[PDB]
Amino acid sequence: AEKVLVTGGAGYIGSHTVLELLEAGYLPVVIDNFHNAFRGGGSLPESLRRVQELTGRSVEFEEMDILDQGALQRLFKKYSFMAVIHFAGLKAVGESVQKPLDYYRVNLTGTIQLLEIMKAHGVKNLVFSSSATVYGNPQYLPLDEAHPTGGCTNPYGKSKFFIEEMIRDLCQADKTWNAVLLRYFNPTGAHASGCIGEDPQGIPNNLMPYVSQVAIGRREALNVFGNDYDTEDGTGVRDYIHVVDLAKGHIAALRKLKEQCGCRIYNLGTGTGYSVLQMVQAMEKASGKKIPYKVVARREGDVAACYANPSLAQEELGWTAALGLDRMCEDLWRWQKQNPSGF
Amino acid sequence: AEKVLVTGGAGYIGSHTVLELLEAGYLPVVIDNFHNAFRGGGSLPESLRRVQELTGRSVEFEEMDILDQGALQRLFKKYSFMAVIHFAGLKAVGESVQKPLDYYRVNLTGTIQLLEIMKAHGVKNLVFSSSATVYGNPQYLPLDEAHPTGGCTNPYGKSKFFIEEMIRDLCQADKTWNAVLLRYFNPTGAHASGCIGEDPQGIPNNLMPYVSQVAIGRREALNVFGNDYDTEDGTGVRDYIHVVDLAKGHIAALRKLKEQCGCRIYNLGTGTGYSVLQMVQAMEKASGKKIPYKVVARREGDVAACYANPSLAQEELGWTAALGLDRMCEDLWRWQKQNPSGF
Ligand SMILES: NC(=O)c1ccc[n+]([C@@H]2O[C@H](COP(=O)([O-])OP(=O)(O)OC[C@H]3O[C@@H](n4cnc5c(N)ncnc54)[C@H](O)[C@@H]3O)[C@@H](O)[C@H]2O)c1
Ligand SMILES: NC(=O)c1ccc[n+]([C@@H]2O[C@H](COP(=O)([O-])OP(=O)(O)OC[C@H]3O[C@@H](n4cnc5c(N)ncnc54)[C@H](O)[C@@H]3O)[C@@H](O)[C@H]2O)c1
Ligand SMILES: CCNC(=O)Nc1cc(C)on1
Ligand SMILES: CCNC(=O)Nc1cc(C)on1
Ligand SMILES: [Cl-]
Q1: Helix (H) or strand (E) holding A140
Q2: For this UniProt entry, which segments traverse the membrane (chains A, B)?
Q3: What DSSP state is assigned to residue A105?
Q4: Angle B135-B265-B208 (CA atoms, 0-180°, nearest 5)?
Q5: Sign of the C-alpha dihedral, residues B325, B331, B336, B337?
Q6: Which string of DSSP letters, residue by residue, matches B15-31?
Q7: How far apart are CA A101 and CA A268, in angstroms?
Q8: B89: CA distance to ligand 2 center in Å?
Q9: Contact B186, B208 (CB under 8 A)
C-alpha cells in the first residue's frame, strides 16, 4: 500500500529503475514533465508504456513539474510514500555552461522543494541519483568515497555537489532522515529486451549514443577529443556502467534505507575504466559495423582518466555490477537496431 | 528615472545602505517580507521611516517575498531598475545548523529567482552582499581574494558560497552581466544619529550585541570562549566593520558596475582584527560601564584569528573603512541607549 515516488522516472535511468522496482515487487508512482522524455500514444511516456508491457505490471504516472509547489503538495497528500528516488533534473554538461540558471533552477530549487514537501509529510527516506563528477579532477585513482568533493568545473557538476551538501546538512540536523547518495559516471547499454534505452534528441553529447548512431549510419564519424593523454592508447579513459546494473543499484539503495542508515554515500560502477578506442572497438564487435573516427583537439576541462572504486557498495549495499563491456555494447546495439529513430 | 532595487532593505545593513543610496543621489526601491525587520506605524518599516527623516527624501517600498515569482515578475514590470543590491536572506550562522533547508530555500531559491527575473528584464547589474565565511578556516592571514573558498562547514556559509558560484557561472555564460560580490565579516555600530541600528537578534553572529547588553545591565556577564589562543591576549581575534563603512562599500560596488566590470570580488573591512578583550575594553570606554566576563572553554571549531585584507577594494573600488573600534562602540552604544528595545 506504501509507494515509492520516482521523479524524472520517464527518462533513461528512471525508466530502467521503474522496471527494476516493478520486478522487485515495489509500487512506483512516477512524475515527469516530459522535458527529456517522449510522449506515448496514451497517457504514459513511451518508455513507461513499454515498461508496463515488459513487466506485465502497471505504472502510476502523473505529468507534473517538480518546480510546481502546489502540484507537489497535492501529490504528497494523494499518495502515501515510504521513500523517494530522485532523478528529475537537467544533466547536459555543455548546456549547463551555456544556461547555468536553468540548471540551478531545476536541479537546486527542484530538489529543495522536494525535500521540503518530504519533510512536511514525514517521508524522510531518499535515494538521490548523484554524479561522480562531484569528485572534480581526480587526485588519485580509482576514486573512492573518501576522495575530496567540490571544485567541479561546470554548472551541472556544481549543482550535483550543492545538492549533496544540502542533503548532508539536512541529515546532520535531523538524524531521523535516511538518504543514500549514489555517485556514478556514464550509464550505458539498455534493457536486454532492446525495447527501451537512451533516446537523445539531436546530436548526442555522450560518447556511446554517438558511437551507436555512427554504427547505425545516422552519423558519419566519431570525434575523439584528444589522443595525446597520459593513457595506454592516448585517448581519455572513462567509467561506463550498464544502466540495468545502475538501476539495480538504486534498488539496493532503497533497501539500505530500511536499515535506518542515516546519510550514506556510495559509488556505483564496475571498477574498470575504458578508453575511447576500447569502446569503439567493443561497439564494432557488437555491431559488426565499422565505426569511423577522427582525432580532434582535447575538450576544455577533460582529464586523462577518471573511474570509480565500487568496493563500498559491494560491501554495504550487497551490490555488484554484473554486466561488462561486451554486454553494454550488445545491449546498446540491440536498442539502436530495433529502434533506429528511438521511441 | 532609473531606480536601485534593494532586497532585504528594511534590515540592518540594508537600511544603512538605503540611507547611503539617498545621500549619493540614487532612487531606492526596497522589498522586504519583514521576516527579520520591524513594521512602523505607517506603510514603511520603522527603519526606512527613520531613514526618510534622516535624509529628507522618500524611499519606495513593497512588502513581498523574494520567493514569490509572481510578485517578482510584477515588481520588475512596475519599476525600471538599473541595478539590484541583494541583502534579502537568512543570515544567522547558528540557526543555519539547526534549520539548513530554510537557509537553502530562502538564500538559494530566492537568489535564483531574483537572477532569473533580472535576466528576463535585462537588468544585469548586481551587488551581492556575500560573506567572508566563504573562505572557511584561514590558511593564511589576512584573508585576501586569492584565498581558497568553499570548505565552509556551516550551511549559511555554504549557501553564500553556492550563490557566489551561481553568479560566477552566470557571468561566465553572459559577458553582458556585471556583478560585484562583497565579502565581509561582522557588521557593527550604527548610523551616528543613533536613530537606526541593528534590532535585537534571536541568534547573533558576533559578541558586540552581548557586550552592549551587559553594559546596559540587561545581561550579567559576557561568556568568553577560550583565553588560551595563539593571540596577543589569548582571546579570539575577529573581524568587525562599521555598518556605515559597509553601506558605503555597497555604494562603491554599485558605482563600479558602471565600468562594465564583469564579475568582481572584493573584501570589505578595516584590515585589522580585534580580540574579545579589546572589544570589552572599547565598550567599557564608550559606555562608561563595567562589563564583567567569564572565560569558559573554547567553542569546538573556533580558530584563534580570522580577518580580511581590504587592499583590493581600496585599489579598485577607491574604498576604505575609516571608522575604528572605538567609533563602532560609541555608535552602537548611542543606538542602544536611545533605543533600548530597538525599533
Ligand atoms: N546520464 C548521465 O550520464 C548521468 C550521470 C550521472 C548522474 N545522472 C543523473 O541522473 C538523473 C537524470 O537521469 P537520466 O540520465 O536518465 O536523464 P534523463 O533526462 O533521461 O532523465 C531525467 C528525467 O527528468 C525529467 N525532468 C527534467 N526536469 C524535470 C522537472 N522540472 N520536473 C519533472 N521532471 C523533470 C526529464 O523529462 C527526464 O525524463 C539526474 O539526477 C542526473 O544528474 C545522469
Ligand atoms: N549580519 C551579518 O553578520 C552578515 C555578515 C555577512 C553577510 N551578511 C549578509 O547581509 C544580508 C543580510 O543583512 P543583515 O545582516 O542586515 O540582516 P537582516 O536580517 O537585518 O536583513 C535581511 C533582511 O532580509 C529580509 N528578508 C529575509 N528573507 C526575505 C525574503 N524571503 N524575502 C524578502 N525579504 C526577506 C529580512 O526581513 C531583513 O529585513 C544577507 O545577504 C547576509 O547573508 C550579513
Ligand atoms: C559524442 C562525441 N564524442 C565523444 O564523446 N568523444 C570523446 C569522449 C572523450 C573522453 O574523448 N572523445
Ligand atoms: C555569546 C557572546 N560571547 C561571545 O561571542 N564570546 C566570544 C567570541 C569569541 C571568538 O570568543 N568568545
Ligand atoms: Cl518489496
Answers
A1: none
A2: none
A3: I
A4: 55
A5: positive
A6: HHHHHHHHHTT--EEEE
A7: 29
A8: 5
A9: yes
Instruction: Give backbone dihedrals phi and psi of A117, rounded to 5 degrees, phi first.
Output: -75, -35
Q: Which three cell numbers stand for residue A64?
A: 507534473
Beta strands B293-296 and A240-242 are unpaired
The residues, ordered by sequence, that sit 6+ positions from B68 with a Cβ below 8 Å of its Cβ are: none
CA quadruple A330, A335, A338, A340: dihedral positive or negative?
A: negative
Helix, coil or strand: residue A92: coil
User: Was A132 annotated as part of a binding site?
Assistant: yes
What is the DSSP track for A13-71?
HHHHHHHHHHHTT--EEEEE--TTS-B-SSSSBHHHHHHHHHHTS--EEEE--TT-HHH
Instruction: Kindly list the structural domains of chain A, giving each domain's residue range(s) and its CATH number in brackets, ordered by start.
Output: 2-188+239-269 (3.40.50.720), 189-238+270-343 (3.90.25.10)
Resolution limit, Å: 1.7
Measured between alpha carbons, how far apart are the two ends of chain B, in Å?
A: 32
Interface of A with B (CB under 8 A): 97-101, 104-105, 108-109, 112-113, 115-116, 119, 150-151, 155, 158, 162, 165-166, 169-170, 172-173
Could you say which of B109, B150, B170 has the minimum Cβ distance to residue A100?
A: B170
Residue type, A319: W
Cell digits of residue B299: 567553542
Residues, chain A, total? Answer: 343
| Distance in angstroms (rounded) separating the CA atoms of residues B150 and B164 | 10
DSSP codes of every residue in B233-262: SSSPEE-EEEHHHHHHHHHHHHHHHTT---
Best CA proximity match to B33, nearest among B59, B7, B14:
B7
CA distances from B14 to A29, A255, B58, B329 (A): 46, 49, 15, 20
User: What residues contact residue B164 under an 8 Å CB cut-off, 6+ apart?
Assistant: B128, B130, B134, B149, B181, B265
- Tally Cβ neighbours within 10 Å of residue A72: 24
**Method used to determine the 3D structure:** X-ray
Q: Which of A108, A150, A165 sits opposite B112 (nearest CB)?
A: A108
What is the spatial distance between Cα B209 and Cα A294, in angstroms, rounded to a whole number? 67
CA distance B22 to B12: 16
Sign for the CA dihedral angle at A233, A238, A242, A248 comes to positive
Tell me how far the alpha carbon of residue B120 lies from the centroid of ligand 2, in angstroms.
24
DSSP β-bridge partners for residue B60: B29
- Ligand 2 centre to CA of A75 (Å) is 33
Beta strands in A98-239 (DSSP E): 125-129, 178-183, 186-188, 222-225, 237-238
Q: Which residue has the cell 595563539?
A: B230
DSSP for B307-331, please give it: -B--HHHHHHH-------HHHHHHH
SS3 A341: coil
Flag whether A299 is marked binding.
yes
| β pairing state of B293-296 and B222-225 | parallel
Query: Is A26 a residue of the active site?
Result: no
Residue in B104, B156, B229, B293 annotated catalytic: B156
Which among A112, A150, A151 has the least Cβ separation from residue B104? A112
A210 is in an annotated binding site: no
CA–CA distance, B250 with B244 (Å, rounded to integer): 10
Rg (CA), chain B: 19
- Cβ proximity of A122 and A257 under 8 Å: no
* Side chain identity at residue A14, one-letter code: G
